[PDB]
XYZ file of C-alpha atoms in Angstrom:
561
model
C -31.261 -0.518 0.459
C -32.239 -4.207 0.818
C -30.333 -7.189 2.089
C -30.932 -10.167 -0.283
C -29.360 -13.674 -0.179
C -27.909 -15.352 -3.273
C -27.724 -19.166 -3.430
C -24.334 -20.371 -4.618
C -22.345 -23.425 -5.787
C -18.935 -23.444 -4.116
C -15.446 -23.737 -5.684
C -12.460 -26.151 -5.653
C -9.541 -23.773 -6.693
C -9.962 -20.680 -4.450
C -6.841 -21.308 -2.253
C -5.405 -17.914 -1.218
C -1.648 -17.585 -1.410
C 0.763 -15.497 0.754
C -0.195 -12.691 -1.576
C -3.957 -13.407 -1.739
C -6.078 -15.170 -4.441
C -4.344 -14.539 -7.830
C -6.080 -15.566 -11.100
C -6.192 -14.309 -14.724
C -9.064 -11.741 -15.214
C -11.126 -14.186 -17.334
C -11.665 -16.493 -14.286
C -13.222 -13.551 -12.424
C -15.445 -12.130 -15.075
C -16.668 -15.364 -16.727
C -17.006 -17.741 -13.668
C -20.504 -17.335 -11.971
C -20.093 -15.970 -8.463
C -16.278 -16.468 -8.319
C -15.521 -13.008 -6.868
C -18.822 -12.700 -4.953
C -17.934 -15.960 -3.198
C -14.359 -15.139 -2.335
C -15.402 -11.663 -0.898
C -18.141 -13.278 1.165
C -15.493 -15.840 2.384
C -13.076 -13.023 3.482
C -15.945 -11.257 5.245
C -17.092 -14.487 6.857
C -13.699 -14.946 8.598
C -14.803 -11.774 10.548
C -16.929 -12.913 13.430
C -20.506 -11.494 13.509
C -20.357 -9.438 16.775
C -17.324 -7.499 15.535
C -18.875 -6.532 12.127
C -20.782 -3.398 13.340
C -17.851 -1.503 15.089
C -15.659 -2.406 12.090
C -13.908 -0.631 9.316
C -12.301 -2.356 6.381
C -9.959 -0.311 4.113
C -10.596 -1.183 0.392
C -8.452 -0.181 -2.652
C -6.200 -1.312 -5.581
C -3.351 -0.789 -8.036
C -5.790 0.429 -10.651
C -5.731 -2.442 -13.255
C -8.822 -3.473 -15.299
C -11.832 -4.909 -13.372
C -10.687 -3.155 -10.132
C -13.889 -1.134 -10.087
C -17.018 -3.474 -10.147
C -14.923 -5.832 -7.984
C -14.837 -2.911 -5.348
C -18.544 -2.394 -6.106
C -18.948 -6.120 -5.092
C -16.942 -5.686 -1.862
C -19.263 -2.812 -0.982
C -22.647 -4.663 -1.398
C -21.402 -7.804 0.287
C -19.654 -5.885 3.170
C -22.905 -3.899 3.612
C -25.444 -6.841 3.731
C -22.993 -8.723 5.844
C -23.015 -6.207 8.699
C -19.771 -4.299 8.153
C -20.259 -0.831 9.672
C -17.857 1.174 7.552
C -15.623 1.066 4.452
C -12.699 3.607 3.827
C -12.030 3.368 0.072
C -9.253 5.444 -1.660
C -10.660 7.974 -4.157
C -11.689 6.397 -7.424
C -10.731 3.020 -5.863
C -7.019 4.020 -5.961
C -4.874 3.140 -3.064
C -1.253 1.778 -3.394
C -0.258 -1.400 -1.252
C 2.018 0.695 1.143
C -0.899 3.224 1.399
C -3.474 0.594 2.404
C -1.162 -0.755 5.237
C -0.507 2.878 6.460
C -4.269 3.695 6.583
C -5.193 0.335 8.367
C -2.581 0.928 11.007
C -3.603 4.614 11.342
C -7.381 4.477 11.686
C -7.168 1.121 13.674
C -9.046 -0.921 11.148
C -9.939 -4.631 11.195
C -8.176 -5.088 7.944
C -7.856 -4.074 4.345
C -8.759 -5.664 1.001
C -6.173 -4.615 -1.537
C -7.154 -5.323 -5.196
C -3.780 -6.023 -6.810
C -2.125 -8.734 -8.937
C 1.175 -6.863 -8.034
C 3.782 -7.065 -10.939
C 1.574 -9.486 -12.953
C -0.011 -7.597 -15.915
C -3.504 -6.231 -16.107
C -6.241 -5.766 -18.678
C -8.983 -8.109 -20.182
C -6.419 -10.929 -20.650
C -3.972 -10.290 -17.881
C -4.233 -11.009 -14.126
C -6.341 -9.830 -11.207
C -6.557 -10.754 -7.430
C -7.911 -10.111 -3.907
C -5.088 -9.527 -1.380
C -6.517 -9.495 2.253
C -4.378 -7.699 4.897
C -5.129 -7.735 8.682
C -5.293 -5.348 11.794
C -1.446 -4.804 12.017
C -1.503 -3.582 8.437
C 0.378 -6.651 7.061
C -0.727 -9.607 4.805
C -3.085 -12.245 6.307
C -1.030 -15.024 7.966
C -1.333 -18.794 6.804
C -3.665 -19.461 9.746
C -6.151 -16.898 8.355
C -5.527 -17.527 4.574
C -6.383 -21.228 4.952
C -9.541 -20.454 7.020
C -10.580 -18.340 3.981
C -9.808 -21.527 1.938
C -11.913 -23.881 4.103
C -14.890 -21.471 3.678
C -14.450 -20.669 -0.133
C -14.629 -24.437 -0.814
C -17.724 -25.183 1.275
C -19.887 -22.004 0.736
C -23.693 -22.433 -0.019
C -24.928 -18.809 0.148
C -23.660 -15.228 0.279
C -25.330 -12.012 1.603
C -25.718 -8.960 -0.655
C -27.413 -5.485 -1.167
C -27.969 -5.597 -4.999
C -29.281 -2.066 -5.219
C -26.428 -0.249 -3.350
C -24.082 1.789 -5.597
C -21.568 4.350 -4.078
C -19.763 6.994 -6.283
C -15.978 6.414 -6.195
C -15.059 9.890 -7.520
C -16.687 11.979 -4.818
C -14.615 12.607 -1.586
C -16.301 12.474 1.888
C -18.828 10.405 3.798
C -21.852 8.573 2.251
C -24.555 6.975 4.400
C -27.013 4.332 3.416
C -29.912 2.618 5.154
C -30.041 -1.204 5.113
C -33.447 -2.988 5.569
C -34.419 -3.883 9.192
C -31.036 -2.618 10.468
C -30.818 -0.015 13.310
C -27.374 1.250 12.122
C -26.544 2.886 8.744
C -23.790 1.679 6.481
C -21.120 4.297 6.073
C -18.807 4.465 3.014
C -16.020 7.134 3.253
C -13.981 8.402 0.338
C -10.523 9.400 1.292
C -7.926 11.218 -0.935
C -5.543 8.439 -2.180
C -2.211 10.194 -1.228
C -2.833 12.287 1.922
C -2.451 9.977 5.051
C 0.502 8.255 3.227
C 2.304 11.604 2.513
C 1.306 12.747 6.024
C 3.177 9.667 7.377
C 6.142 10.296 5.119
C 6.302 13.886 6.449
C 7.364 12.681 9.949
C 9.748 10.040 8.612
C 11.776 12.217 6.283
C 13.008 15.838 6.228
C 10.893 17.099 3.352
C 12.592 20.533 3.642
C 16.141 19.125 3.006
C 14.649 17.249 0.097
C 12.725 20.277 -1.366
C 16.019 22.195 -1.300
C 17.696 19.258 -3.162
C 15.032 18.894 -5.938
C 14.180 22.600 -6.345
C 17.305 24.624 -5.329
C 20.252 25.945 -7.485
C 22.158 22.580 -7.429
C 18.989 20.743 -8.641
C 19.245 16.988 -8.685
C 17.642 16.135 -12.035
C 15.659 13.008 -11.211
C 13.561 10.663 -13.393
C 10.702 8.636 -11.900
C 8.756 6.130 -13.977
C 5.647 4.665 -12.522
C 4.716 2.257 -15.414
C 1.177 3.645 -15.379
C 0.512 1.875 -12.127
C -0.735 3.015 -8.723
C 2.252 5.204 -7.717
C 1.441 7.778 -10.439
C -0.777 10.099 -8.232
C 1.604 9.673 -5.244
C 4.633 10.602 -7.338
C 2.998 13.685 -8.813
C 1.558 14.855 -5.452
C 4.601 14.173 -3.147
C 7.609 14.663 -5.518
C 6.267 17.208 -7.971
C 3.709 19.348 -6.054
C 5.037 19.222 -2.525
C 8.802 18.732 -3.046
C 8.900 20.887 -6.116
C 10.189 18.502 -8.666
C 9.875 19.893 -12.238
C 6.579 18.275 -13.670
C 8.611 16.471 -16.358
C 10.436 14.487 -13.629
C 7.414 12.160 -13.399
C 7.098 9.689 -16.251
C 4.164 7.323 -16.755
C 2.363 8.610 -13.656
C -1.269 8.280 -14.766
C -3.132 4.991 -13.681
C -3.967 2.995 -16.826
C -6.183 -0.161 -16.684
C -3.765 -2.351 -18.683
C -0.681 -0.498 -17.350
C -0.325 0.655 -20.993
C -0.197 -2.852 -22.542
C 2.906 -3.767 -20.405
C 4.458 -5.603 -17.392
C 4.850 -3.428 -14.233
C 8.074 -5.210 -13.172
C 10.942 -2.907 -12.078
C 13.906 -4.624 -13.538
C 16.409 -3.649 -16.279
C 14.612 -5.851 -18.863
C 10.995 -4.727 -18.326
C 11.714 -1.076 -17.474
C 14.017 -0.757 -20.468
C 12.428 2.621 -21.531
C 13.586 4.388 -18.371
C 17.034 2.668 -18.671
C 17.733 3.892 -22.246
C 16.595 7.430 -21.165
C 18.888 7.135 -18.134
C 21.884 6.117 -20.376
C 22.384 9.622 -21.959
C 23.801 11.477 -18.854
C 21.377 14.422 -18.295
C 19.675 12.880 -15.246
C 21.402 12.217 -11.903
C 18.888 9.860 -10.433
C 16.309 7.492 -11.854
C 13.875 5.014 -10.337
C 10.878 2.822 -11.192
C 8.145 0.810 -9.402
C 5.874 -2.161 -9.935
C 2.084 -2.449 -10.134
C 1.097 -1.790 -6.480
C 4.407 0.075 -5.834
C 5.946 -1.901 -2.930
C 9.012 -2.754 -5.118
C 11.783 -0.454 -6.495
C 14.520 -0.157 -9.050
C 17.293 2.414 -8.329
C 19.431 3.980 -11.118
C 22.396 6.427 -11.106
C 23.707 8.763 -13.929
C 23.962 7.023 -17.499
C 21.983 3.959 -16.256
C 24.223 2.772 -13.300
C 22.160 -0.039 -11.873
C 22.083 -0.187 -8.088
C 21.445 -3.871 -7.267
C 18.521 -4.305 -4.762
C 20.931 -6.191 -2.479
C 23.665 -3.536 -2.435
C 20.923 -0.920 -2.063
C 19.451 -2.065 1.339
C 23.070 -2.242 2.420
C 23.765 1.456 1.325
C 20.572 2.796 3.090
C 21.906 0.714 6.118
C 25.341 2.324 5.908
C 23.762 5.844 5.980
C 20.512 5.125 7.883
C 21.007 8.003 10.372
C 20.721 10.512 7.558
C 17.013 9.780 7.938
C 15.031 11.678 10.665
C 12.835 8.599 11.408
C 15.884 6.411 12.375
C 17.477 9.124 14.543
C 14.375 9.471 16.796
C 13.172 5.752 16.660
C 16.493 3.832 16.816
C 17.502 0.838 14.585
C 16.538 -2.319 16.491
C 17.486 -4.890 13.828
C 18.537 -5.555 10.247
C 17.200 -8.286 7.807
C 17.116 -9.979 4.448
C 15.916 -13.049 2.601
C 18.620 -15.844 2.103
C 18.910 -15.614 -1.768
C 19.734 -11.862 -1.302
C 23.463 -10.937 -1.107
C 25.912 -10.461 1.832
C 26.362 -6.723 1.317
C 23.869 -5.964 4.112
C 25.718 -8.364 6.377
C 29.118 -6.575 5.849
C 27.283 -3.400 7.093
C 25.282 -5.171 9.849
C 28.449 -6.764 11.280
C 30.225 -3.428 11.759
C 27.494 -2.556 14.273
C 26.140 -4.556 17.289
C 22.735 -4.549 15.657
C 21.008 -7.944 14.965
C 20.921 -9.512 11.499
C 18.383 -12.019 10.366
C 18.457 -14.252 7.297
C 14.985 -15.367 6.234
C 12.941 -17.251 3.522
C 11.492 -15.304 0.593
C 8.416 -13.253 1.528
C 7.255 -10.435 3.821
C 5.563 -12.424 6.711
C 9.074 -13.346 7.932
C 10.006 -9.676 8.045
C 6.559 -8.763 9.328
C 6.822 -11.030 12.306
C 10.228 -9.659 13.481
C 8.989 -6.018 12.907
C 5.962 -6.811 15.154
C 8.359 -8.480 17.692
C 10.270 -5.179 17.683
C 13.312 -6.825 16.298
C 13.588 -5.179 12.936
C 13.801 -1.672 11.619
C 15.309 -1.808 8.079
C 14.928 -4.778 5.641
C 15.450 -5.934 2.040
C 15.064 -8.476 -0.722
C 16.906 -9.169 -4.008
C 13.576 -9.223 -5.776
C 13.661 -5.380 -5.914
C 12.291 -5.005 -2.406
C 13.116 -2.587 0.393
C 11.236 -1.600 3.576
C 11.151 -0.628 7.220
C 8.947 -0.883 10.329
C 7.129 2.307 9.493
C 4.326 0.065 7.895
C 3.800 -3.749 7.490
C 4.416 -4.455 3.777
C 7.255 -3.146 1.499
C 7.374 0.483 0.127
C 8.642 1.548 -3.338
C 8.416 5.351 -2.914
C 9.807 5.201 0.674
C 13.026 3.516 -0.741
C 13.386 6.269 -3.381
C 12.943 9.029 -0.761
C 15.473 7.320 1.624
C 17.840 7.367 -1.359
C 17.179 11.109 -2.030
C 17.705 11.851 1.686
C 21.171 10.096 1.459
C 21.980 12.036 -1.685
C 20.861 15.320 0.068
C 22.991 14.699 3.215
C 25.954 13.403 1.216
C 26.215 15.818 -1.763
C 27.923 12.956 -3.722
C 26.681 11.267 -6.900
C 25.097 7.707 -6.738
C 28.163 6.034 -8.289
C 30.530 7.544 -5.636
C 28.229 6.298 -2.866
C 28.729 2.761 -4.125
C 32.531 3.071 -4.652
C 32.786 4.374 -0.988
C 30.530 1.505 0.155
C 32.462 -1.247 -1.701
C 35.848 0.314 -0.580
C 35.002 0.406 3.125
C 32.818 -2.696 3.205
C 34.115 -4.716 0.243
C 31.892 -5.701 -2.739
C 29.464 -8.679 -2.665
C 29.204 -9.266 -6.527
C 25.706 -10.468 -7.326
C 23.618 -11.767 -10.105
C 20.591 -13.911 -10.657
C 19.801 -16.572 -13.184
C 16.166 -17.306 -13.722
C 16.007 -20.768 -15.482
C 12.395 -21.006 -16.390
C 10.083 -24.004 -16.417
C 11.935 -27.315 -16.765
C 10.872 -31.005 -17.018
C 10.273 -32.208 -13.474
C 12.423 -35.386 -13.256
C 15.887 -33.802 -13.797
C 15.668 -30.876 -11.298
C 14.542 -33.146 -8.481
C 17.462 -35.457 -9.109
C 20.101 -32.724 -9.378
C 19.090 -31.223 -5.962
C 19.273 -34.773 -4.454
C 22.731 -35.650 -5.930
C 23.962 -32.196 -4.901
C 22.514 -32.728 -1.356
C 24.300 -36.120 -1.171
C 27.467 -34.394 -2.438
C 27.121 -31.351 -0.128
C 26.416 -33.295 3.099
C 29.562 -35.498 2.665
C 32.297 -36.163 5.276
C 34.967 -34.884 2.825
C 32.775 -32.141 1.201
C 33.650 -29.240 3.545
C 37.308 -27.926 3.750
C 37.766 -28.717 0.038
C 39.237 -26.254 -2.423
C 37.432 -25.521 -5.781
C 38.916 -23.302 -8.606
C 39.116 -21.738 -12.111
C 41.119 -18.639 -13.363
C 41.542 -16.576 -10.084
C 39.934 -17.426 -6.642
C 40.134 -20.620 -4.525
C 36.776 -21.753 -3.280
C 37.219 -23.633 -0.018
C 33.774 -25.018 1.193
C 33.353 -23.761 4.845
C 29.704 -24.848 5.109
C 26.830 -26.539 3.176
C 23.130 -27.300 3.632
C 19.569 -27.077 2.463
C 18.200 -24.135 4.377
C 15.234 -24.152 6.613
C 13.810 -21.541 8.950
C 12.255 -21.659 12.508
C 10.139 -18.505 12.875
C 10.823 -16.823 16.260
C 7.364 -15.385 16.433
C 4.534 -17.694 15.100
C 6.686 -20.813 15.567
C 6.422 -22.129 12.027
C 9.208 -24.110 10.347
C 9.688 -23.523 6.646
C 11.774 -26.453 5.430
C 13.924 -27.064 2.325
C 13.983 -23.404 1.230
C 17.058 -23.599 -1.017
C 20.253 -25.433 -1.856
C 23.217 -23.635 -0.325
C 26.914 -23.598 -1.344
C 29.246 -21.698 1.090
C 32.956 -20.957 0.300
C 35.147 -19.426 3.172
C 35.761 -15.887 1.671
C 32.032 -15.420 1.555
C 31.137 -16.677 -1.945
C 27.794 -18.523 -2.145
C 25.513 -20.220 -4.733
C 21.808 -20.742 -3.958
C 19.397 -23.000 -5.880
C 15.644 -22.389 -5.703
C 13.308 -24.773 -7.311
C 9.828 -23.210 -7.721
C 8.115 -26.275 -9.206
C 4.531 -26.768 -10.413
C 2.408 -29.913 -10.874
C 0.650 -27.787 -13.460
C 3.038 -26.352 -16.080
C 6.687 -27.408 -15.192
C 9.423 -26.275 -12.647
C 11.592 -23.062 -12.235
C 15.318 -23.408 -11.532
C 16.625 -20.259 -9.774
C 20.349 -19.727 -9.686
C 21.433 -17.056 -7.153
C 25.191 -16.124 -6.937
C 26.711 -13.945 -4.112
C 30.472 -13.532 -4.808
C 32.365 -11.532 -2.238
C 35.480 -9.471 -2.813
C 37.686 -7.146 -0.724
C 40.595 -6.080 -3.017
C 40.965 -2.395 -3.788
C 41.607 -3.251 -7.451
C 39.333 -6.277 -8.129
C 36.111 -4.540 -6.961
C 35.457 -1.873 -9.648
C 35.099 -4.159 -12.639
C 31.994 -5.834 -14.049
C 30.093 -8.560 -12.096
C 29.685 -11.025 -15.026
C 33.502 -11.191 -15.409
C 34.048 -11.342 -11.611
C 31.365 -13.993 -11.050
C 32.074 -16.156 -14.230
C 34.349 -18.904 -12.541
C 31.745 -19.253 -9.700
C 28.954 -19.395 -12.361
C 30.556 -22.295 -14.267
C 31.572 -23.908 -10.887
C 27.820 -23.911 -10.053
C 27.195 -25.811 -13.288
C 30.206 -28.198 -12.648
C 29.135 -28.999 -9.016
C 25.397 -29.349 -9.760
C 26.072 -30.743 -13.264
C 23.364 -28.463 -14.529
C 23.208 -29.056 -18.342
C 23.869 -32.760 -17.677
C 20.299 -33.420 -16.410
C 18.360 -30.525 -18.085
C 20.120 -29.498 -21.280
C 19.743 -25.750 -20.444
C 22.480 -23.410 -21.760
C 21.538 -19.856 -20.912
C 19.250 -18.120 -18.301
C 15.772 -16.960 -19.426
C 16.344 -13.760 -17.422
C 19.507 -12.310 -15.815
C 18.542 -9.919 -12.930
């Protein structure tokens, strides 16, 4: 094969985010050298002398355009000097799988091809997510160096001619012009090292007895035709012996079957109506790249992502991996509820509150300060890898069910009766007109920082909301030293009830108003009723303290999660 150089005109908008360069498919396929240029930028952050002894792990969630994009990574990685590429078979490799392989084979980094929950197809999204040597996402320091290069690029190296076969397992060797070392591509099974890792984490025998045996937990797993499909079939059906019909939508489709891979009650409605009938005992779903998870009990019983990390924390020793490794720290993102904190307090194990997004988690896990962690955005994880893991949260749940021999609903009533219930909901108030939102946060800040603000009692119908604290939350990272300022408006009432405001604004379309409400409760009687009734005073109070409709006109939430 020959190494030929292509002259190129650089780009203004290729700024990689904390989740890599995301853009609608059209940008990639119609814009001359868009992809080619970004791939060559990623590769160019790798210093020349290290290219030969290096192995990059490549692979994606399976959406449209994944394939010739991988074929681009190959020819550019090859001309560029990269010694070896370990690609999942047929390009498939889930996000938790790509971290697990990087970490395992001691690779320089991976190049995951996933637009995560954002849809796929000809007119849907795409994206090049770069991860680094520890298996986690590239840090700001690295993402921006990719940015400085994407913007100033003149020419990229390529082997036009080179075309590997993604279906065939095993090693393929190619000879590059005037190069004394061959370029090695290596096709790995997509599920094997990942299931091998899971095998030493969990007790697959206890589980096999639970899914196969006389008592047979009748589970229902929907994979929304995303990357987890193979992994669900292989690990739950073949190895654990789950009846083949337990796995729904487990075949990788390019457009995810014309739908959104978002694991939430709204988007994964199909699974939820099927779960309503009562046959099944357990249900669960995952997003695009499968590092997110939705847990469901008999008849549809929604286990809130916040309460969930807290249940796995309150039964963590039921898992073989925690019993031999030890739990050296608990953690969550600030908008996520206080349920994990009622568990974390009971123990002399550290608890960290952090801004939204894995790097925060990642840094503590590398600093050996965190073992189990969660998010309210349907995210759960541990230090076993360096990204979140959908399927690992479902299996931790099945291991608790196996040890406990209780239904999911009873597990939550026991949790809320020993720990107390943090009622939680989330109001997504989509895209508003800039000027109001900015004002409301400012008036509320002026109101919240007042000399007479704290100590004051607020009320409506039942509970008295005495303000014990107030601020606009910022974080000082203990590891890379960064300070993430103004992360969210915080309202803290003495019993534990909170209200968080998160303004994800864009000088492009408009600005998102996120209303997060954590309402704690400890009464034996008040706990078992519905959250919308139990949170209602605190929901209106949020509107009466912020004076929400007053500067926006918005009545209802676009999405309730």
